[PDB]
A paper describes a structure:
The Legionella T2SS exports at least 25 proteins. In summary, using a combined cellular, structural, biophysical and biochemical approach we have provided a characterization of three novel type II secreted substrates, NttA, NttC and [name], that are required for infection of several species of amoeba. We also report the X-ray crystal structures of [name] and NttC, the solution nuclear magnetic resonance (NMR) structure of NttA and dynamic analyses for each substrate using complementary biophysical techniques.
Crystals of [name] were obtained at pH 6.5 and the structure was determined using selenium single-wavelength anomalous dispersion (Se-SAD) phasing with electron density maps refined to 2.2 Å. The final model contains two molecules in the asymmetric unit and all residues could be built except for the N-terminal His6 tags and the [name] residues Asn1 to Ala6. Each [name] protomer is formed of two domains, with the N-terminal domain (residues T20 to N143) composed of 7 α-helices and 3 β-strands, and the C-terminal domain (residues D7 to F11 and G146 to L269) formed from 5 α-helices and 4 β-strands. Two disulfide bonds are present in each chain of [name], one in the N-terminal domain between Cys62 and Cys90, and another in the C-terminal domain between Cys259 and Cys268. The [name] α1 helix mediates hydrophobic interactions with the α4 helix in the C-terminal domain, and it appears that small changes in this interface results in large changes in the orientation of the N-terminal region.
Author numbering: 7 to 269
The structure:
Amino acid sequence: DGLIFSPLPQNKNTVVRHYSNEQEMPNLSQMAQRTIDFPTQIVRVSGNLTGLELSCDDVENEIDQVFSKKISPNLFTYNTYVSCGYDVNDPEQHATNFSIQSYFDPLTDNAVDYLKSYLKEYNGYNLFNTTTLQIENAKGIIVSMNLNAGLKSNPDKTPFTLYRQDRNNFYFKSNFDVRKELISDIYQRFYSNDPDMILPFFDKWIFSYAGSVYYSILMASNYLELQPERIFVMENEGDIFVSDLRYYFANLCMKRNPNKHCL
């Protein structure tokens, strides 16, 4: 229970690397040291490497030198997937293709200064003379958040009795603002059996009188989930980005509360 990452799509003959600190609770003290809006940075880059005679270790090294190692978990929240396909039948098993999927946010004014300088030097960097490292500004994010409430009889397994499902939708300027407002509130109030914490959390995020509807449902339930789907809105009309890098909040009331229910 808590923040669970969704399984990686694991292709046939492909090295896959996942780097994230999105699992770490938002640090409101740190984030208060950012005094301006800055867009979430997006990387959705891919390239054919057939014929360049690169190994997967060469591809991973170049991406680490120009991207991964420049984005520190002390200055940024990031979620990054790096993949490198190789030719199983080639006597050298040379890399045939690669991709970088990332979103990341500077957490402070000093991180924003460091970022502006990283972008000036590295935005547009020639990767393997095949494609460029394009770091894009998301215009904003729409969170389409699902709530599940129900009764699970075995906490080690996936199946449960679903009692109620709700969706609500919010626009934020960045993933930074998602973490500062919604994610911090999940940690503070969604994981509470104090009715004056969780019922008002529901009034704010689910629907304005969800607190009244859910009192009886929470008393009958032992298991909640929140799935905040992050839909990044890009600058061009009709361009959305959703990272394969997904997380959800599981709340095992059965184990957290003395009475083994959500209320």
